[PDB]
Design an enzyme around this catalytic site. Structure first.
Site, PDB file in Angstrom:
ATOM      1  N   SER A   1      34.239  44.254  43.423  1.00 22.83           N
ATOM      2  CA  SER A   1      34.686  43.195  43.780  1.00 22.83           C
ATOM      3  C   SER A   1      34.106  41.755  43.131  1.00 22.83           C
ATOM      4  CB  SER A   1      35.252  43.398  45.285  1.00 22.83           C
ATOM      5  OG  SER A   1      36.180  41.887  46.107  1.00 22.83           O
TER       6      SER A   1
ATOM      7  N   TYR B   1      37.328  37.473  39.094  1.00 27.16           N
ATOM      8  CA  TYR B   1      38.385  36.366  39.620  1.00 27.16           C
ATOM      9  C   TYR B   1      38.382  35.274  38.429  1.00 27.16           C
ATOM     10  CZ  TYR B   1      41.068  38.720  43.171  1.00 27.16           C
ATOM     11  OH  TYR B   1      41.865  39.463  44.382  1.00 27.16           O
TER      12      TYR B   1
ATOM     13  N   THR C   1      41.216  40.092  37.391  1.00 22.36           N
ATOM     14  CA  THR C   1      42.671  40.532  38.130  1.00 22.36           C
ATOM     15  C   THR C   1      43.023  38.836  38.093  1.00 22.36           C
ATOM     16  OG1 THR C   1      41.307  41.495  39.718  1.00 22.36           O
ATOM     17  CG2 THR C   1      43.347  40.201  39.742  1.00 22.36           C
TER      18      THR C   1
ATOM     19  N   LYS D   1      43.658  43.750  34.349  1.00 23.78           N
ATOM     20  CA  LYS D   1      44.062  44.466  35.622  1.00 23.78           C
ATOM     21  C   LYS D   1      45.272  43.567  36.882  1.00 23.78           C
ATOM     22  CE  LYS D   1      42.039  45.321  40.186  1.00 23.78           C
ATOM     23  NZ  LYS D   1      42.614  44.585  41.026  1.00 23.78           N
TER      24      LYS D   1
ATOM     25  N   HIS E   1      48.458  44.934  42.932  1.00 28.06           N
ATOM     26  CA  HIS E   1      46.790  44.625  43.746  1.00 28.06           C
ATOM     27  C   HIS E   1      47.255  45.417  45.235  1.00 28.06           C
ATOM     28  CE1 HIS E   1      44.326  41.238  44.170  1.00 28.06           C
ATOM     29  NE2 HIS E   1      43.832  41.707  45.824  1.00 28.06           N
TER      30      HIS E   1
END
Ligand SMILES: Cc1cc2nc3c(=O)[nH]c(=O)nc-3n(C[C@H](O)[C@H](O)[C@H](O)COP(=O)(O)O)c2cc1C
Ligand SMILES: NC(=O)c1c[nH]c(C2CC2)n1
Ligand SMILES: NC(=O)c1c[nH]c(C2CC2)n1
Length: 359
Positions: A105, A129, A155, A233, A257
């Site tokens: 992450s 991100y 993402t 994603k 998600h």
């Protein structure tokens, strides 16, 4: 004690503080999609072949050209040190032991470099991100490259954070001793002790840090920024999957998600076939959302996914026993998947075909 993934969740609920368990468990709003990610798997029925010789079952496969021991990989779950003191370091060590990959992450409680140092031989990818600050974003990609990560999972379903009701009720924030370790400022590190409003701290963090304007133009920027493989994603539509391919991306992770963003979207197992059809074999297609059992993995592969990612089960493994707990969760999934393969007549992943399932 714990012999299936559901046991690990039940144990986690018993040991974790409520706000932490609720953060990890929750879906968006009334949690319709959360329930359906699991229910949907049950509607897909299995049509096993008998008498195929399954003495030597080979679970190995490849994700974006890198060999893995099984088509079951660790998905990005933020802030793993809430579940166990060693957090993401424990997770990466378990992936190294298993021979599978870890998606890290951007909101990890351990740095890109710390995780690479704990799991130097582990297959590792970065979930990215797109921050309003493109220099922050670039630094993340550059660190991933320097530190031996093999792909970027961008993402694309989080221009804003979903509305997770319990996090709003609990006024979710990190515990005092923890930070998002990839960033150096009090706000970008999600410092508790910093002003994140009166509702979910994380929703306010996203609103301050993450860019809601991103578009296909930003995917063009990212594709020019790095020659690493890039996976989109959070794609749920065939048209968007074709657009990702047109932009030179290298895979699609079919994901809602973990049902934490828009509630009322379909289960990922139900949208998987449209997406596999839409990409026409040009890139690998992966799934996450609701994987709990070996038969879930089998069904996803029958419908054309290369591999699946697991989110919450990994966190429950941490909550039980850190590295060992993550290893045990992954070993359970591996064994259930082996058995499901064998009972279905599949010697290897290459022979897991579409006639094995029907809805
Ligand atoms: C607690 C938690 C934290 C998550 N954090 C992130 C994240 O930081 N970045 C991201 O792209 N997705 C994140 N996700 C989504 C997961 O990558 C993944 O899509 C989802 O967990 C898969 O569903 P599952 O939990 O049913 O296995 C998170 C999911 C959960 C449950
Ligand atoms: N699954 C269990 O009941 C259990 C107990 N101890 C462990 C350690 C991970 C080896 N796993
Ligand atoms: N690295 C790749 O897989 C890839 C695909 N397309 C492009 C364009 C030159 C930006 N790069």
């Amino acid at each position: 004690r714990l012999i299936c993934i559901n046991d690990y969740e039940q144990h986690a609920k018993s040991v974790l503080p409520k706000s932490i368990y609720d953060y990890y468990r929750s879906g968006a709003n009334d949690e319709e999609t959360l329930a359906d990610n699991i229910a949907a798997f049950s509607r897909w029925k299995l049509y096993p072949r008998m008498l195929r010789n399954v003495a030597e079952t080979d679970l190995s496969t490849s994700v974006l050209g890198q060999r893995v021991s099984m088509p079951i990989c660790v998905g990005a779950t933020a802030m793993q040190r809430m579940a166990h003191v060693d957090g993401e370091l424990a997770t990466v060590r378990a992936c190294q032991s298993l021979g599978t990959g870890m998606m890290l992450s951007s909101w990890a409680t351990s740095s890109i470099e710390e995780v690479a140092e704990a799991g130097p031989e582990a297959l590792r990818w970065l979930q990215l991100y797109i921050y309003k600050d493109r220099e922050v974003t670039k630094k993340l990609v550059r660190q991933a490259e320097k530190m031996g990560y093999k792909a970027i999972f961008v993402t694309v379903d989080t221009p804003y954070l979903g509305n997770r009701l319990d996090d709003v009720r609990n006024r979710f924030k990190l515990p005092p001793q923890l930070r998002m370790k990839n960033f150096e400022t009090s706000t970008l590190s999600f410092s508790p002790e910093e002003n994140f409003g009166d509702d979910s701290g994380l929703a306010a963090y996203v609103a301050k840090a993450i860019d809601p304007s991103i578009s296909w133009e930003d995917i063009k920027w990212l594709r020019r920024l790095t020659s690493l493989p890039i996976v989109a994603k959070g794609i749920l539509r065939g048209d968007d999957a074709r657009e990702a391919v047109k932009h030179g991306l290298n895979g699609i992770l079919v994901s809602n998600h973990g049902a934490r963003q828009l509630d009322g979207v379909p289960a990922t197992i139900d949208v998987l076939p449209e997406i596999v059809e839409a990409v026409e074999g040009k890139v690998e297609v992966f799934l996450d959302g609701g994987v709990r059992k070996g038969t879930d993995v089998l069904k996803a592969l029958a419908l054309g996914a290369k591999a699946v990612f697991v989110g919450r089960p990994i966190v429950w493994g941490l909550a039980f026993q850190g590295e060992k707990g993550v290893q045990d969760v992954l070993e359970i999934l591996k064994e259930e998947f082996r058995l499901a393969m064998a009972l279905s007549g599949c010697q290897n992943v290459k022979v897991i075909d579409k006639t094995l399932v029907r809805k």
